Amino acid sequence: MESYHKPDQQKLQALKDTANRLRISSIQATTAAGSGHPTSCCSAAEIMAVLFFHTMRYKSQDPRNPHNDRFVLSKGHAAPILYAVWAEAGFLAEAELLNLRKISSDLDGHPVPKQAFTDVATGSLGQGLGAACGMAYTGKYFDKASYRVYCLLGDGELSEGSVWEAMAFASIYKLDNLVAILDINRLGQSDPAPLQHQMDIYQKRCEAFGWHAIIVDGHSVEELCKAFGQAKHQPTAIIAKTFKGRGITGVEDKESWHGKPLPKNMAEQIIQEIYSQIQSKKKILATPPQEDAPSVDIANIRMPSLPSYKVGDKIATRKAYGQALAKLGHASDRIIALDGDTKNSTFSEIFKKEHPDRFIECYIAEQNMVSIAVGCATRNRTVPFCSTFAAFFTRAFDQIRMAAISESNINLCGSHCGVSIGEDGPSQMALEDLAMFRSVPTSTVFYPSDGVATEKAVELAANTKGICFIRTSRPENAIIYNNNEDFQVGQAKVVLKSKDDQVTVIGAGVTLHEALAAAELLKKEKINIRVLDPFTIKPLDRKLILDSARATKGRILTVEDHYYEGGIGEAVSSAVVGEPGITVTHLAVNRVPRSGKPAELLKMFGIDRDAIAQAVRGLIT
Amino acid sequence: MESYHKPDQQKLQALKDTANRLRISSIQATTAAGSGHPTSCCSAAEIMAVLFFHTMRYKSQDPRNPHNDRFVLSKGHAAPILYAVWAEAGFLAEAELLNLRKISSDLDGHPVPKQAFTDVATGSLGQGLGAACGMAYTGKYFDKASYRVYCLLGDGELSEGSVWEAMAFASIYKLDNLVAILDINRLGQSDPAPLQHQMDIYQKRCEAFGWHAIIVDGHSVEELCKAFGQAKHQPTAIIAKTFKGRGITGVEDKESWHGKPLPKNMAEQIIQEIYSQIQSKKKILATPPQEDAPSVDIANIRMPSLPSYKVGDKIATRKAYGQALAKLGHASDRIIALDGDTKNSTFSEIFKKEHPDRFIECYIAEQNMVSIAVGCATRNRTVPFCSTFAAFFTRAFDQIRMAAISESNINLCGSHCGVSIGEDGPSQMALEDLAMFRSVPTSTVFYPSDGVATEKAVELAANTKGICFIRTSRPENAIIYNNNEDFQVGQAKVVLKSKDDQVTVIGAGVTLHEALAAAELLKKEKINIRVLDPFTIKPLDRKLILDSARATKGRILTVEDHYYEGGIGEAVSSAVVGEPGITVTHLAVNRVPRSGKPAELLKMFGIDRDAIAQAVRGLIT
Ligand SMILES: Cc1ncc(C[n+]2c([C@](O)(CO)[C@@H](O)[C@H](O)[C@H](O)[C@H](O)COP(=O)(O)O)sc(CCOP(=O)(O)OP(=O)(O)O)c2C)c(N)n1
Ligand SMILES: Cc1ncc(C[n+]2c([C@](O)(CO)[C@@H](O)[C@H](O)[C@H](O)[C@H](O)COP(=O)(O)O)sc(CCOP(=O)(O)OP(=O)(O)O)c2C)c(N)n1
C-alpha cells in the first residue's frame, strides 16, 4: 500500500508454505542438474518468500520495469531459489526450473542479465551490495523515485572488503531506501564463517558502519515481515540468524554440504517431508509498484561543439579528459561521473565543478566505485564515467570482469599511465592496464594521444556499449590533430608519411610523440619512418596497419609505455602474424620501474626517441 | 628493556626535537625534488619519532635483521619521513635525503625493497596492514619470536576494503604482537576523509572488528610513548588525532595541499620556524632487539620421491596440486599454504590435513590472502602457496601487482580455469588469468596438463623466485607423462609427432587433451598433427615451437580455454611473428560463456577436438 499491512495467521502460513515450495524447487532443480547449492538456498527460503510475497513491490510480468523495487542476490549461488520465486510469481514456467544449468536453458548456475529478472551478474562474492548501492543512489538522487533496493548476502561473503566499502558508502550517502539482508547461516564453503552465530558482533559491526541493524530469526516469517515493514532514515541491515540447509533433516546446520546436491533417493524422501508441512497449494500474488520513475532519453549523446584545441598547444590527455567530460555533461543529463579521491589528478574535478549533482565521490575504494557505476547503469538509468589512476583499476579487476558478465555499459578513465608519470615510481604507474582491459571480452580500449583525440574518445565512449576504457597520460604533449579530424572506434591514423618510409612505427600517448621526435632525428640521417597512432588498441585497425606495413618494406615497430605482455605490441603481433613479408619488432617496458624524471625513465626503459631511432636503424640494417 | 621505560621531560623534548627534524627533512627533500607529500609526512612526525626512538627495537645498522621489530609504512607517500628516520638512526647518510626521487638515488617516491629498510613496497593504499598481518602471524606462530609489528595507515586509506579484511584477520588470529597506527589527519587527497575528526566512530569500528582501540593526541609524544608502551592480548589500534601539515604555519589543517611541495621561498621560512622550536641537536639512539628468531634453511626444496602416477589413470590437475603440495610439505618445513574458503575445491585441504600448523585459512578475502602471503615471505621466513579459483585472483590483482614491485617470492595456484568447469557458469571461469599473470613482470606461469606435470610444477615453483602462478583445472584427464619425465621452466614437450605432420597444435590443460583427441580423429582421414604442451606459458619455449613449426610446413595452431587477448595464442604470436613461412592460427573463447556440461561448452566456444580438427583441415586446404 503505503501503510504496513500486518499479516494474519493465514497470510503467515501462506508465506511459510511459499518458503517450503521454494525449498522443494531448489532441491528438485539441483538434484536434476547434478550440481548446485541447495543448502544455501534453504537458509534463505523465508527471507525470499517474505521479500517477494509481502514486502517488495514489482510487476511480476515485467521484471525490468523502472518503477519496480530492486532485488540483488549477492550470494549468487542461491540462484535456484531466485528462479523459484520468479516461477512462484508467475513469470517463469514452473517446468523450466528443472532445466537448471542445462545448455538448453537460461537458468544458469549463477544469475546473469540474459534473465529479465536479473540486473547484475553475481557469483563473485561480495559485489552485489555495491551494485545495490548504485541502484539506491540512483533511486534517491537521480530518479527521485519510490522504489526500494533489497540485497541478500551470505555470512562468509561478509569477509570480502568490498562489502564494507559498500556499507560505508551507504551511510555516507544516507541510502535510507536500501536494505541489506544478511543470511547468517553459520557456515561458509569449507568451514564455519568466522563469527558463526555471534549475532551481536554482526550487529556491532553494522552499527559502527552507520547502519540501523536488526537481529531477527531468519526462519520466522512474522519477524521478517515486521522488520522489512518498518522504513528508517538509515540504510537498514536485517541480520538474520538462520541454519544452512534449513528444513533438510540431517543436513540442517551440518558441515560438508556446501555446493553438494542431494542424491535422487534422498531428495525424494526430503521433499516428501517438506511437502507434508505445506498447508495449501494456493499461491500469493505479487503487488505492483507506484509508477513514479521518470522517463529517460535514449538518444545518441553529442558534444555541443567540436574540440577547441589548437595545433601546437600543449595539454595533458588527463586534463583534456576532464575538460571533455564536463563539456559532455552540458549536452546530456544522463552523464554521471565517479572518482576515488583522485579528482584533482584525473581532472574529473572539472565535471564536479560544473555538474555537482551528477558527481559521486567514491573515496579510496576502487572496487566499490566500479560496482556503484554498474548499479547506476542498470536499466539504462545513467551513463557512468569512473576515474582513478589506471594502476588502481587493477584493484577492481574482478568488479570489471563481472561487469562484462553483467553486460554492463560503463566507462572507465584511468590516468597516470606508464613510466612517463616520473617521480612517484612504479606503485602509481599503469603498465598492465592494456593487458587487463583487453582481456575483458566486451571492452573497447581508447588510448588518445592528444587533447583532440581525448575529447573524441569521451564522446565515442559515451555512445558505445560494453566496458569502455580510456587511458590518459600525466605529462603534457602537443596537439597534433585538427579540431575537425574525424575519429572512429577501430580507425587508426597515419600521422607522418613519405614515399621513402622504411619502417611503420606504431606508438600511442607519449610514445607517439617520442616516435615523431625520432622521425625528426632520423631525417638528419636521411631516414624516413611512417608513424601510426592506433586511437583504439581494441579493436585494432588491422587494415591500416597492414597497408602501412606494405608501404614500408613489411616492417612494423611498436613502442609502448606498458609491459610487453598483453599490450599494443602483442595486439599488433596477433593481428598480423603470418602475413608475408610482415615483420613486427617491439619496444616496451621490461621490468618494474623506479623514480626519475619522465624523460629519464622513457630513456632508461627503452621507449624514447633515441630507442626508437636505434630500433629503426637496426631493422634497416 | 622489557619494562616500559617511562620517559623524562628531556627524553620527551628529544622526541619532539626528533619529530621536528623529521618535518624539516621531509620539506627539504620534497622541495629539492619538486614533488612529494610533505603535509602527509608532517602529520606523522611524532608517531615516527616515538616508534623509531622510544618504542621499537631494531639494529640500526642491519634493517633486515630477522630479530628486529617490523615497521610497515602503509601510507607509502610519506616515504620522505621514512627515509629521514633511517638517517636519524644512522643507517642512511643525511646528505642522501636531498636526492629524493632522483634517477641517481634509491630514495624513490614510494618505499621499495631495493632499500634495506623496506620489506614490502607500498604506494597502492590499503595493502600494508595485510602484509603486516603476515609478518605478525609469522612472528607469533612460525618464528615464535619476540619481535613486534607496527603499521602506519592514513585515514583516507581506511576506505579500502582490504584494510578491513586485515582488521578481521588480525582479531581471528589473535595477533597481539601487531599494532596499527591510524594517522587521523582529517583529510585525504582531494577532500576531507569521510569521518574527519569523529574519533569515536573510528574507535567503534576498530572495536567492532576485535581490536583494542586507544584514541590519542597524535602530536603528543608522551601520549604516544604511553600508548605504545602497553602490550595487549589483542591487536591494538592507536587512533591518532593529527593535523595534516602539522607544524607548517598556514598549511596545517588546510585543503589543497596534498601531494604539493612547498616552494623554495616558503620552505626556507617554514624550516626556520620549525628549527626555532628544536632545543638540542643531539640525536637519540635506536635500541636493539632480543635475538630469538630461529635460523631458517635456505636450500633447494626437493620432493621426497618421483610422482607416483600411472599413465592412463585419470586425475584432475586441481587434485594433483593438493597431493603435490602436501607431499612437498613433508620435504620442507618452510612450505606454508593459504586458501580463501575454497580448500575442498582447490584441494589445499590435503595439505591442511597433513600439516595443519602450516595452513592459514584466509576466508573469503583474496586481497588479504595475497598480502598475508607477501608478508610471510618477507625476509625469506617461509615459502607460501596461496590458492583459490583462478577467477578470484582477479580480485587481488593490485596486491599481485604490488607483490612484484615488492620483489616478493610467492606462489599462487588458481583452480577452475576456463569453460571446462561446466555448470557454474562464467562467474567461476578463469578466462583472463593468463593475461593477468603474464603482465606481472616477475612471473612464471605454469599450466600443467596432467598430474605428473602438476607435481613437477609445484616443485619447480617452490624453488623459483618471483610471482609463480600454477593454473589448475576442474575436470579429470588422463596421465600422459611417465613419472620420470624431466620438466623445466621454459621447456615444452612434444607429446605427439610423426614424420608426416602438417600442423603443430599447441594446447594446454583440457585443450591439450582435446588436441590429442583431434589427432585421433584426423588420423582416420590420414592427417597427422604434431601436438605440443608448453608446460610454462611464461617463459615460452620459443625454440621448440619454431623447430616444431619448421617440421609442419610452418604452421602453428594454438588452442586455449581462455579469452583471445593475453593468453597462449598471443604469447606464441609475439614469440614468432616475422619468422619466414611461420603462420599462427588461433582458437580461444570469444565472449562471456554460460552454463552447460564441460564438453558442451568446449564445443560451443570452439576449443574442442572437433574445432581443432576443422581448423587443421582449413590450414591444409
Ligand atoms: C570472490 C569469491 N571467492 C570465493 C568464492 C567461492 N565460493 C562459492 C562458489 O564459487 C559458488 O559461487 C563455490 O560454491 C563453487 O560453486 C564451487 O564450485 C562449488 O561449491 C562446487 O565445488 P567443486 O569443487 O565441485 O567445483 S560460494 C562460497 C561460500 C559462500 O558462503 P556464504 O556463507 O557467503 O554463503 P552461504 O552459501 O549462504 O552459506 C565460496 C567460498 C566465490 N564465489 N567468490
Ligand atoms: C589504491 C590507491 N588509490 C588511490 C591512490 C591515490 N592517492 C595517493 C597517491 O597516489 C600517493 O600514493 C597520490 O598522492 C599521487 O602521488 C599523486 O600523483 C600526487 O598527489 C600528485 O598529484 P599529480 O596530479 O601531480 O600527479 S595518496 C591519496 C590520499 C591518501 O589520504 P590518506 O588520508 O590515506 O593519507 P594522508 O596523506 O596521510 O592524509 C590518494 C587518493 C593510491 N595511492 N592508492
Ligand SMILES: [Mg+2]
Ligand atoms: Mg553462510
Ligand SMILES: [Mg+2]
Ligand atoms: Mg589523511
Ligand code: NA
Ligand atoms: Na560506453
Ligand code: NA
Ligand atoms: Na616460487
